[PDB]
Amino acid sequence: SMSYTWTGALITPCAAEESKLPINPLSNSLLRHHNMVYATTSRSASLRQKKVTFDRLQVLDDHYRDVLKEMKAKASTVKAKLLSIEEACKLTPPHSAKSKFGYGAKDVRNLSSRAVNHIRSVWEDLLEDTETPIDTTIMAKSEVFCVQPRKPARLIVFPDLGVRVCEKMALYDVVSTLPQAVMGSSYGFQYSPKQRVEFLVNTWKSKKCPMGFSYDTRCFDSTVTESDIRVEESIYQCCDLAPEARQAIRSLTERLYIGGPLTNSKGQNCGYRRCRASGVLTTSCGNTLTCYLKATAACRAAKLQDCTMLVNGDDLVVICESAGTQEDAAALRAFTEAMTRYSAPPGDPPQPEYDLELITSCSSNVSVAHDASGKRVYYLTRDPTTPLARAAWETARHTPINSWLGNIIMYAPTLWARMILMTHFFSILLAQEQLEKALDCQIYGACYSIEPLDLPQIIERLHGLSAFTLHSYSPGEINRVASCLRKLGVPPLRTWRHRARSVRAKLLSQGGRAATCGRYLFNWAVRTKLKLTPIPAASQLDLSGWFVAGYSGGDIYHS
Numbered sequence: 001s002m003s004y005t006w007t008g009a010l011i012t013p014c015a016a017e018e019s020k021l022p023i024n025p026l027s028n029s030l031l032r033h034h035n036m037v038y039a040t041t042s043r044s045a046s047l048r049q050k051k052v053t054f055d056r057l058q059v060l061d062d063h064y065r066d067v068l069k070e071m072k073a074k075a076s077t078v079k080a081k082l083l084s085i086e087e088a089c090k091l092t093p094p095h096s097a098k099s100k101f102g103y104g105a106k107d108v109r110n111l112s113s114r115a116v117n118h119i120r121s122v123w124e125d126l127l128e129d130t131e132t133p134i135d136t137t138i139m140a141k142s143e144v145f146c147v148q149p150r151k152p153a154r155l156i157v158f159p160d161l162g163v164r165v166c167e168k169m170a171l172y173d174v175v176s177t178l179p180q181a182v183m184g185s186s187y188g189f190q191y192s193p194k195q196r197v198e199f200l201v202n203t204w205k206s207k208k209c210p211m212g213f214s215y216d217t218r219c220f221d222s223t224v225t226e227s228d229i230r231v232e233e234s235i236y237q238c239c240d241l242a243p244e245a246r247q248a249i250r251s252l253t254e255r256l257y258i259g260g261p262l263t264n265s266k267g268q269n270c271g272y273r274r275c276r277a278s279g280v281l282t283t284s285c286g287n288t289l290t291c292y293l294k295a296t297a298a299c300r301a302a303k304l305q306d307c308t309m310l311v312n313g314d315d316l317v318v319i320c321e322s323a324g325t326q327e328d329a330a331a332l333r334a335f336t337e338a339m340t341r342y343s344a345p346p347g348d349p350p351q352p353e354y355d356l357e358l359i360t361s362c363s364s365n366v367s368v369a370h371d372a373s374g375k376r377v378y379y380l381t382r383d384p385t386t387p388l389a390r391a392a393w394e395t396a397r398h399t400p401i402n403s404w405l406g407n408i409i410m411y412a413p414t415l416w417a418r419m420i421l422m423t424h425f426f427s428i429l430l431a432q433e434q435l436e437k438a439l440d441c442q443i444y445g446a447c448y449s450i451e452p453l454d455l456p457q458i459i460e461r462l463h464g465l466s467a468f469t470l471h472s473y474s475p476g477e478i479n480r481v482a483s484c485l486r487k488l489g490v491p492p493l494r495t496w497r498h499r500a501r502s503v504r505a506k507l508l509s510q511g512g513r514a515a516t517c518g519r520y521l522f523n524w525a526v527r528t529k530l531k532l533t534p535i536p537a538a539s540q541l542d543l544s545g546w547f548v549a550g551y552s553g554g555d556i557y558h559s
């Protein structure tokens, strides 16, 4: 069937949409070519709609069924709990889209009589009505990028706040613990960036002759079929579940996840969906399970040998035992055909990679640098173009989510996050006298509130003290960063070094936590290095819930 059907009504915005970067005195010091920076708007929605709309092809074989049963057996060990309204509400982000039933984010978290009473009625309804298609709103997502030698906005389909709270009640526990139980070490969201690298590097070394590749599925969400979603429900159903939760999953599956009507911001019937919705609680879990299933089965059809998968939603990377250049290329092609039959055709054709640093998964790649002692140290990085374009935009305008803070946390050891983002933002935060202020950001889709002053500890716990001393990066990483700077018009190292030394001095004079950031974060900038000993606060940090599972589109907030 058709991934989508359209009525003609347009996907409309719900206010004014900024497309260009504001000429700002502060954004200009970070990036000079402001015209290369842009944000998607509903004005490009038509272009997107045509790309995600198509008839899906699907043929299932014995390999698929086999892997499916393997997966179900493991799911069979699971015991999901079911959250009470109270907890599900606690999980709602303070700034999440309001409900059309008289209440909003704040009321939900505050457990207002009106919000809880409505939520209750939606839950009862999910228990009584097993059919009626649940209404969703479709919107053009606004995201920032740098022009290329432009991207049309992405679309998001999400149900009402009321319905979202119920999804949590019935599936929060499931989507937080079933992926790991079913896929084990292949589930990428259980790893912190450093743990992801270690898993990738060790996996790579465990091969006599390693061969690896990333697989890009062309619009993965639209390739998800009604069948894949029921197969996915079948996996969830192997769990021990409270009666009400079992019915909630059954009804939410037929009424929401397999598809339903599309309404715009004006309240107009836009069309219908018969593929994955991007703004539902099961999206990450669902996509990860389905990609792993098709991929694993695809590997068997292709005869790839000793495959180790690493899956994060629709993002996939496979590392296996080489069989030779020609044989690897043939196997890879066979893999792609198997995936195509399973309704997961490629966007970018896949290519075998014999160099670990050249494999990009989760928009990132593993690379290597050196610590003070001089020992090689592997770490996660990525092309900084987008991270930087967005740092510029968030500098010029107020945004709910600060990706820059999220990028500093996840890529702390990188040459670009240290030299550019830390310097730029600590300089700016000192000025505005807002170093104490907590900011929201996302990690694997879950929303968190973090104090910039804590970055030193956070970085030590997740990356180790070496994140403050890495130097001598790879020639490949250096060219990528440098050619990035030229493109966006970012000041060179010298300028940044001067700024960092000036910010570092200012941070050291304040003492307390600010001096902590001064000493650690900017030690790369001075010549007279300061001995960097373990930060006490790093040994008393609970950062486990940070890397448990994916939540993108889940409307998840970790208090």
Ligand SMILES: CC(C)N(c1ccc(Oc2ccccc2)cc1C(=O)O)C(=O)[C@H]1CC[C@H](C)CC1
Binding pocket: 415, 418, 419, 470, 471, 472, 473, 474, 478, 481, 482, 485, 492, 493, 524, 525
């Ligand atoms: C060796 C030495 C001088 N050096 C480098 C300076 C420039 C560079 O590569 C470029 C080139 C152009 C633009 C940006 C970086 C790479 C390195 C390195 O450590 O290998 C450093 O000490 C870095 C160490 C990390 C900080 C955070 C910035 C300076």
Ligand SMILES: [Mg+2]
Binding pocket: 216, 217, 218, 219, 220, 314, 347
């Ligand atoms: Mg893709």
